[PDB]
Every structure is written in C-alpha cells, then in structure tokens.
Amino acid sequence: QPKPILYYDERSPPVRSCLMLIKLLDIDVELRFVNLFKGEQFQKDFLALNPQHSVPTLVHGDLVLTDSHAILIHLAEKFDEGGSLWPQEHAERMKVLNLLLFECSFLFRRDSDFMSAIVRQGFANVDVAHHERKLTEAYIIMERYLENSDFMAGPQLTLADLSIVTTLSTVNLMFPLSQFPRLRRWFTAMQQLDAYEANCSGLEKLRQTMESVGSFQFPSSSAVVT
Amino acid sequence: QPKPILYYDERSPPVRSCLMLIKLLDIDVELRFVNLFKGEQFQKDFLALNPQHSVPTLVHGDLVLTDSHAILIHLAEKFDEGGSLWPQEHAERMKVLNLLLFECSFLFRRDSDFMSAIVRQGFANVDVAHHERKLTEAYIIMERYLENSDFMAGPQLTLADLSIVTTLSTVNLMFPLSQFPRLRRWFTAMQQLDAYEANCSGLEKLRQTMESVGSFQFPS
Numbered sequence: 108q109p110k111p112i113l114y115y116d117e118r119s120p121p122v123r124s125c126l127m128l129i130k131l132l133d134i135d136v137e138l139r140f141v142n143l144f145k146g147e148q149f150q151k152d153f154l155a156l157n158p159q160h161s162v163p164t165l166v167h168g169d170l171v172l173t174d175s176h177a178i179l180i181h182l183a184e185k186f187d188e189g190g191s192l193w194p195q196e197h198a199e200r201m202k203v204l205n206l207l208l209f210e211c212s213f214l215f216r217r218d219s220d221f222m223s224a225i226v227r228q229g230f231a232n233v234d235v236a237h238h239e240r241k242l243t244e245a246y247i248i249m250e251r252y253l254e255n256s257d258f259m260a261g262p263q264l265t266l267a268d269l270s271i272v273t274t275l276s277t278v279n280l281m282f283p284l285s286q287f288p289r290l291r292r293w294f295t296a297m298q299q300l301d302a303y304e305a306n307c308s309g310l311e312k313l314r315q316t317m318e319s320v321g322s323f324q325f326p327s328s329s330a331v332v333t
Numbered sequence: 334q335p336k337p338i339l340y341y342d343e344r345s346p347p348v349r350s351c352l353m354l355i356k357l358l359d360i361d362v363e364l365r366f367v368n369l370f371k372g373e374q375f376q377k378d379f380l381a382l383n384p385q386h387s388v389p390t391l392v393h394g395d396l397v398l399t400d401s402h403a404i405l406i407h408l409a410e411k412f413d414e415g416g417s418l419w420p421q422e423h424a425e426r427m428k429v430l431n432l433l434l435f436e437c438s439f440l441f442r443r444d445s446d447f448m449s450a451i452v453r454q455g456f457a458n459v460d461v462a463h464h465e466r467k468l469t470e471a472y473i474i475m476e477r478y479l480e481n482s483d484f485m486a487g488p489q490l491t492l493a494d495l496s497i498v499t500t501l502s503t504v505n506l507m508f509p510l511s512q513f514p515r516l517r518r519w520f521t522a523m524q525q526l527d528a529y530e531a532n533c534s535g536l537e538k539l540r541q542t543m544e545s546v547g548s549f550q551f552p553s
C-alpha cells in the first residue's frame with residue numbers, strides 16, 4: 108500500500124490545488140517533478156502513464172488519476188473520510204462537484220486559453236482585450252456564487268475553494284479584482300489559510316516564467332496580496 | 334419529490350449525454366428547450382439560474398446542476414443505485430470520474446475549440462489541419478484507453494461512455510475513425526444501444542445548423 112505519488116509542476120494551478128489539499132490534510136505524498144516548460148510531460152514513460160501528458164497526475168497503488176479534480180476527490184475520500192471538504196450529504200456534495208466542474212470547464216479553460224496565447228504568440232501579439240472579457244466574465248460568475256455564500260460551494264471551505272483559488276490567483280496576476288468585493292473578500296480569506304502557503308511558490312514561478320517567455324510584465328497592481 | 338427539470342438544446346453533445354442516461358434509466362423528467370442559436374441562455378431568468386449560461390442545466394428540487402458530468406453522476410446516484418453505470422467500488426468509480434474529466438477537459442474542449450472557430454471565423458477560414466491534429470490526438474488517447482477493455486472505463490458501460498460518445502459523434506461529423514480500430518468498434522457498439530437513439534436527433538440538428546452558420550458542408 109504505497110503512499111501516493113504526485114507528478115507535478117507547481118506553476119500549474121491545478122497542481123497547486125492538489126498541493127493545498129495535501130498540506131491541509133497532512134498527506135504524506137512523494138513528489139516527482141515534471142518540467143512542463145522543458146517538455147518533460149512528453150517523456151516516453153510519462154506519456155505511457157498519462158497519454159494526456161498533463162500534471163497533476165497521481166499514482167496511488169494501482170490507481171492512476173490524470174485530472175486535478177479526481178485527485179482532490181480521491182484524496183478527500185481517502186484522507187478526509189467523513190469530512191466537510193467533500194461533504195457527506197448528497198446535495199452539498201453535488202454543489203461542490205458542480206463548482207469543481209466550473210473550474211475545469213470555464214475558469215481554467217479561459218485562463219489556459221489566455222496564458223497559452225501569451226506563450227505561443229508573445230504578449231504583444233495577444234488580443235488581451237478579448238481575454239479580459241472572457242476572464243472578467245468568470246469573475247462575474249464567481250461574484251454571483253459568493254453573493255449567496257462565504258465560500259464557493261456553501262458556508263464552509265470545500266474542495267471547490269481549493270480548486271478555484273489557484274486558478275483565480277493566476278488570472279489575478281493580470282486582471283484586477285477591484286470591481287468584485289465578494290471575490291476579494293473570499294480571496295483574502297483564502298490567503299489567510301495555512302494551506303494557501305502551498306500556492307505561493309508555484310504562482311511566483313509561473314509569474315517569472317510567463318514574463319520571460321511572453322516578453323512582458325504583469326501589472327504589479329493587479330494581484331491581491333494579504 | 335418533484336421530478337427533475339432539464340434545460341437543454343439537443344445540439345449540445347453534453348446535453349445528449351444526459352438525454353442518453355435519461356433514456357437508459359427510464360427517468361421521468363420535464364424537458365425545457367433553451368434555443369442556444371437564439372441566445373435564449375442569456376434570458377434573465379436562465380442566467381439567474383445558471384450564470385454560466387450553459388446547457389445542460391438540471392433543476393431537481395432545490396438542487397441546480399450546471400454541468401453535464403455532475404448531472405450524469407447525480408441522476409445515476411438517485412435513479413440507478415446499485416447499477417454498473419456509476420460503480421460503487423472506489424477504484425472503479427475514480428476511473429469513471431477520471432474519464433468524465435478527460436471528456437470535459439480534453440475531448441470536449443478541443444471539439445468546442447474547433448466548432449467555435451467555425452462560428453467565429455467561418456469554415457472556409459478555419460485552420461482545419463490544426464484542429465485535425467488536436468482532435469486526432471484525442472482519438473489516439475481514447476484508442477489507448479480501449480486497449481484493455483470493451484468500454485472507456487472498463488469491461489462495462491459507464492457514465493464515461495455516455496459522456497464521450499456524444500462528443501465523439503460530433504467530432505466524427507468531420508474526422509473519420511477508420512484509423513482507430515478499437516475506437517471504431519467501440520463507437521459502432523455504442524450506436525447499437527437503444528439509448529443511443531437519444532443522440533440521433535441532436536447530432537443531425539447540430540450538423541444542419543453548423544452547416545448554415547459555417548456556410549459549408551461537413552465532409553460526412
């Protein structure tokens with residue numbers, strides 16, 4: 108019954124969500140670095156493990172998970188059994204699942220589109236206003252989700268907050284949260300959590316890498332700093 | 334308990350996955366059509382319900398689900414407790430979940446990218462070779478997933494097959510499966526399912542609407 112193995116590159120927001128859960132729950136996990144900027148995700152053995160050539164990838168015994176949201180759910184069920192991060196009551200759990208899928212299908216997709224365009228085209232050649240519209244629309248949606256509750260999926264911290272805060276912090280490197288009071292209040296609260304320390308290093312490394320590869324600077328005024 | 338309400342436009346592959354499960358499980362639902370090509374997902378009451386302005390959206394009592402994969406899991410858990418579609422064993426369930434997320438993050442994302450490019454740019458201006466690459470890569474991955482099993486997540490049909498097949502068939506409007514023996518056999522087998530009837534109307538409607546909006550004709 109070996110301990111979980113996490114193939115990771117901390118610059119990835121989804122990776123940082125798993126790192127946050129691992130810290131929060133004090134899970135002993137072996138970390139194996141896969142440098143996405145060097146193309147190590149295309150190494151023959153890693154491609155054999157995960158044809159999607161993506162991180163995070165978790166190997167836990169015979170189970171191989173290739174999506175951060177399955178990893179969060181699996182680790183919560185194995186190490187937060189009966190807990191509130193992945194709540195027990197069906198309706199509450201479905202709400203968390205719904206927000207995890209929002210992060211996958213909407214927030215991360217749009218941030219990935221924007222950041223991938225910077226890498227492929229160079230910042231100066233990206234239609235920044237187009238991506239500002241796409242990502243501001245995500246801000247609007249999250250502000251709507253927090254108008255009803257202090258956390259994304261209810262009155263208390265869940266996997267949904269861990270998944271969303273890492274990508275939110277990455278989007279906020281570029282786009283300010285000035286017009287989004289509930290989102291700012293939530294993001295500030297998330298930054299006070301001990302587990303949020305697992306987000307800081309990879310976010311800074313991503314900032315450095317993006318500014319280098321994209322030949323630009325994020326506006327220092329955008330990022331919320333607590 | 335009030336019956337579930339499904340807001341839908343059957344051109345949507347993820348909508349069609351939910352329609353297939355509803356047929357598979359004989360679920361009594363109220364369907365409410367939201368015409369995506371008239372922008373009805375932006376009607377004030379629907380945005381109020383789903384800020385993502387997306388279908389499928391399920392309202393089941395007080396629970397509002399805004400993603401097909403949550404809808405599939407929810408409906409399987411209410412209406413198919415003890416079935417093989419959403420297996421009870423943890424390892425098997427995680428495998429199904431992992432494949433559902435592949436459909437969302439990889440297969441559907443790339444098909445959505447391609448279809449979106451048609452609408453934004455016009456078919457005649459789409460870099461078809463680029464999207465043929467991204468999507469053939471998805472075919473390659475699914476062919477590998479099928480190495481050991483008859484179905485995407487194992488020896489039996491699961492929610493993962495329902496989610497993947499609808500998007501597959503949409504990709505297959507443009508890109509054939511002749512070079513993927515496992516994938517083609519799997520798709521043919523899926524097409525024999527009684528529940529696959531739920532995919533037929535929306536797939537044909539999507540082709541027809543895409544061809545007017547794209548001002549082209551799919552090679553199929």
Ligand SMILES: Cc1ccc(C(C)(C)C)cc1S(=O)(=O)Nc1ccccc1C(=O)O
Nearest residue numbers: 118119120143144218219222223226277313
């Ligand atoms: C952003 C990005 C672009 C391109 C790459 C390659 C080197 C693989 C081409 C890697 C990354 S990344 O390592 O920084 N990861 C992400 C981080 C934030 C948002 C999206 C992504 C993403 O990969 O889609």
Ligand SMILES: Cc1ccc(C(C)(C)C)cc1S(=O)(=O)Nc1ccccc1C(=O)O
Nearest residue numbers: 180184195197200204406410420421426430
């Ligand atoms: C409420 C409940 C009761 C019993 C079960 C078992 C069949 C495991 C006994 C599972 C659940 S559940 O609603 O809490 N389950 C998930 C939802 C989404 C994604 C994964 C799961 C999961 O069960 O792993």
Ligand SMILES: Cc1ccc(C(C)(C)C)cc1S(=O)(=O)Nc1ccccc1C(=O)O
Nearest residue numbers: 344345346369370444445448449452503539
């Ligand atoms: C019916 C319709 C109307 C309007 C839209 C826009 C949002 C593009 C204006 C999309 C659709 S659609 O339901 O046909 N859309 C997809 C179909 C197949 C694969 C992916 C998609 C997708 O929307 O990403």
Ligand SMILES: N[C@@H](CCC(=O)N[C@@H](CS)C(=O)NCC(=O)O)C(=O)O
Nearest residue numbers: 119121160161162163174175176438
């Ligand atoms: N939905 C997936 C997204 C995984 C993903 O796209 N990871 C990126 C980094 S953020 C990656 O590994 N890219 C490597 C590649 O695509 O080649 C998840 O939540 O894990």
Ligand SMILES: N[C@@H](CCC(=O)N[C@@H](CS)C(=O)NCC(=O)O)C(=O)O
Nearest residue numbers: 212345347386387388389400401402
């Ligand atoms: N991951 C989501 C994707 C939902 C989605 O993107 N639906 C499309 C149709 S395929 C839609 O409703 N588009 C309308 C819009 O975004 O305005 C799911 O599986 O439900």
